A and B are shown apart, each in its own frame.
Chain A
Amino acid sequence: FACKTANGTAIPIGGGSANVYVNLAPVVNVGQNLVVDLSTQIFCHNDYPETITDYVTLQRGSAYGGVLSNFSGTVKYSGSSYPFPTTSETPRVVYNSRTDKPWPVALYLTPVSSAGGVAIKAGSLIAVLILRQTNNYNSDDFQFVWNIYANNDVVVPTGGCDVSARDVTVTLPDYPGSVPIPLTVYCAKSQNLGYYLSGTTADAGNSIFTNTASFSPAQGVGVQLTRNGTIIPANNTVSLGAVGTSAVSLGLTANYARTGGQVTAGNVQSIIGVTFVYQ
């Protein structure tokens, strides 16, 4: 038994080691699979198939550098998927031919959320795959070691952040008062964020959002927003700086502000936009 690589670099009858150089998908998003198909580069044959039968296993697979830190995933060996890094030696595959057939191993890797930029650096070691070969003749137990080196950078584009707003907020008072508006943002990859408000405004200053209740409406009252006391007019970008893993509060308060003639009891309902602007 022996094997070689599509670059025609061999590992002979006793087992031994070799490098395999894989060209990867150059861009992989957080939800997608980065497939590293080793069955198109690693090929084996049995040397005496009319008498001896060869047994081949994925003895172990280990992940290195950017595959170990930024990816999760599996290894498909001959039709079955196991965890990768692997937790144990797979079942046998039989090699019973002198003609080179593939070793059917593929890595299915998904970038996690914390991965960013360059999740696999060009030229670096991605994985070590041990092919174990035994037989029905002697007690020969050989290890074929395949060192998988990435030829190029694998980039995991950063995603937009998550704006977690606990409710669709009751501003009651029907009074007369003010209320915090739970609104926090977090990014998997630290980036600068800005936000601006938008909607129908009633005032020259353009910070008092109209009442739009359409079921026994109040009158004379609008709704204004405040970030720790500071009024936020519509279309005025507020700078949050760098927002990372830790949720940054926007520190919003809803308040009632007057818009005109007699203030009248009733329902006060407004809908405002909040546009987060990416750098």
Chain B
Amino acid sequence: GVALGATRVIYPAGQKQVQLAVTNNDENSTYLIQSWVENADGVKDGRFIVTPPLFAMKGKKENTLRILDATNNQLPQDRESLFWMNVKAIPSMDKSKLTENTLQLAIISRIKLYYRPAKLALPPDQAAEKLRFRRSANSLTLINPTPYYLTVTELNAGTRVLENALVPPMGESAVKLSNITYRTINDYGALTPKMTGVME
């Protein structure tokens, strides 16, 4: 089908446009590509907008999406803000099958989009380790003191596999609950190194 060249987009505040690659693999299919960004609540904000807002990808092809900052510098400047970028591949009307019963599937890819204010003091890579934990006998709470969203994955409490989790800037998340292990996904989509669950 159509696939994106990343699993997330880092938008650095200040830049007028971030680029995102899309690619159609299906040698004999034509798709209309439409793209948009939503805020953390699912609302189609106009905070970010996608460049070309609507084009065709005929056969094996490669295109560039340009995500423009439409915020009016109205976003928090001391922490990331989570948005969702969706790129939808509208398949062409198949005229042959007008007189039959059909199901068309429109495949969409949805990835994180983090707006990243330009002067964060701690750096993206010094973020994961800075996590801490607070235990209860029902739950395990993650305390993210950094200004970056943390994709906590491979959350282990001894033998136990806990919920994967998304911990926001200078905030916390909670999971149903020994020695705590955890990884994080970075800006590149790669798993950080297994780390030791340090308490608060």
Contacts and interface: CB of A to CB of B under 8 A. Distances in A.
A159 B5 contact: yes
Interface string B1-16: 1011111100000000
A181 B189 contact: no
Nearest to A211: B101
Given A158-B7, A163-B1, A168-B104, A27 B188 contact: yes
A223 B105 contact: no
A215 B94 contact: no
Contact of A31 (B21, B99, B108, B151): B21
Interface in A229-271: 254, 267-271
B3 A160 contact: yes
A165 interface: yes
B188 A191 contact: no
A147 B190 CA distance: 29
Contacts, number: 139
Nearest to A254: B103
Given A160-B109, A192-B164, A278 B7 contact: yes
Contacts of B21: 29, 31
Interface string B93-107: 010011111111111
Nearest to A215: B98
Nearest to A179: B103
Interface in B79-126: 86, 88, 91, 94, 97-112
B77 interface: no
A115 to B, nearest CB: 11
A3 B90 CA distance: 59
Contacts of B102: 168-172, 268-270
A189 B108 contact: no
Residue among A174, A189, A279 with the highest chain B CB neighbour number at 10 A: A279
Interface of B, helix, strand, loop or mixed by DSSP: strand
B97 A168 contact: yes
B181 interface: no
B107 A165 contact: yes
Interface in B1-59: 1, 3-8, 21, 25
A183 interface: yes
Residue among B104, B151, B164 with the highest chain A CB neighbour number at 10 A: B104
A172 B103 CA distance: 9
A278 B103 CA distance: 25
Interface of B: 1, 3-8, 21, 25, 62, 86, 88, 91, 94, 97-112, 151, 153, 164, 185, 188-191
A130 to B, nearest CB: 34
18 contacts: A29-B21, A30-B5, A31-B5, A31-B21, A157-B188, A157-B190, A158-B189, A160-B6, A160-B109, A162-B1, A165-B105, A169-B105, A270-B103, A275-B86, A278-B7, A278-B110, A278-B189, A279-B164
B106 A271 contact: yes
Contact of B4 (A118, A156, A160, A273): A160
Nearest to B106: A273
Given A31-B21, A161-B3, A278-B112, A223 B103 contact: yes
Contacts of A169: 102-105
B111 A172 contact: no
Residue among B100, B103, B104, B153 with the highest chain A CB neighbour number at 10 A: B103
Interface in A29-64: 29-31
Q: Identify the 3 closest CB pairs spanning chains A and B, nearest first.
A: A158-B189, A160-B4, A117-B190
B188 A275 contact: no
Contacts of B4: 159-160
Nearest to B98: A215
A9 interface: no
A25 interface: no
B1 A277 contact: no
B33 to A, nearest CB: 13
Contacts of A277: 110-111
Contacts of A65: none
Nearest to B84: A277
B1 to A, nearest CB: 4
Interface in A182-216: 183, 189, 191-192, 198, 215
A220 to B, nearest CB: 14
